[PDB]
Symmetry: C6
Subunit: 71 residues, 6 copies
């Protein structure tokens, strides 16, 4: 649903469902290693060693997963 | 009853607000705040930091890092 | 009139009460002044009697000298 | 016309009409000293010592005029 | 389907032609890879067989090894 | 015939494009390019830099600095 974010929504939903570990590079140069708990259009909820991280997507540069998502 | 595509954001910040959970807020410029959520809209967050008020624009916010986890659904 | 009531109210109180505030930019640069006006994208600041038009996308935080009610 | 940019459009139009010199601080830390030739919603056209500068507004931090605009 | 025909066509050619490209981020950081997919906000890159989901707001420029027609 | 609020931008980049005027393009990260406009839409610019193609996102662009001034109206 909602066009122009089919890749984005699918990919983050795969990361979350598959519990794939990923490095999330922020545009400020900081980085987090975690699993996707949830997302909406503007934010992602992360688990980093049992603590919760709410990351704004405008702050995100890259997702780097441990293993690839099936397309 | 929600504006689509911001249900996670709105709920989480509201949970942070209602529970008055202390959080470290990392800004995109590398600055950081330790405080509690007083209010929010679509574009800004109002923080309580040691009894002083900080109005933070969400575009400048990178991460919310809470002291206690928020209950989801 | 939008989903922006917190921001509009707060900047409006800062203006009306003439509260002095430090405005930290995403630059890491900062301005210390009073708000004269704003719309959705900009704020007009008074800094030692001189006018500064700051874009809101460039702004990080408003830090007021005294709290807004 | 066009609500929520009454301050912005008026102020930049005053700078342009009045030919007031201003320092334009960019969010990258660079700065230009010039006069407003034109603007739309996303850009400003600047004159800096006789040469033209097209500045994107998303790149602009602050306008600092030599003299104040009448409100 | 928008005002975004240049961008959509170009990334689509890069993908179809399998052109290797350097992707410079607003970070000053860079990625060297191939485009697997994109939507309006993200691009999927192949970097040495590993997947990188890069947000378009984080991207500065695409620099292709060979020109697109 | 124009999309409101981008008449200056669209005209100027099109003039730069039609005249093939050489320009220095300063990016927000401090990087810079010297080239000519091949194409643009709302979100990107295509550059010719010494015969090589550069697709620049407009959000990463700070300034266009032209070699020759563009004729306005």
């Amino acid at each position: 649903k909602q066009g122009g974010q089919g890749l984005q929504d699918y990919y983050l939903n795969q990361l979350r469902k598959e519990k794939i570990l990923a490095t999330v590079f922020l545009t400020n140069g900081f980085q987090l290693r975690g699993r996707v708990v949830s997302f909406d259009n503007w934010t992602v909820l992360l688990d980093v060693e049992g603590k919760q991280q709410l990351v704004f997507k405008h702050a995100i540069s890259t997702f780097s997963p441990q293993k690839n998502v099936a397309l």
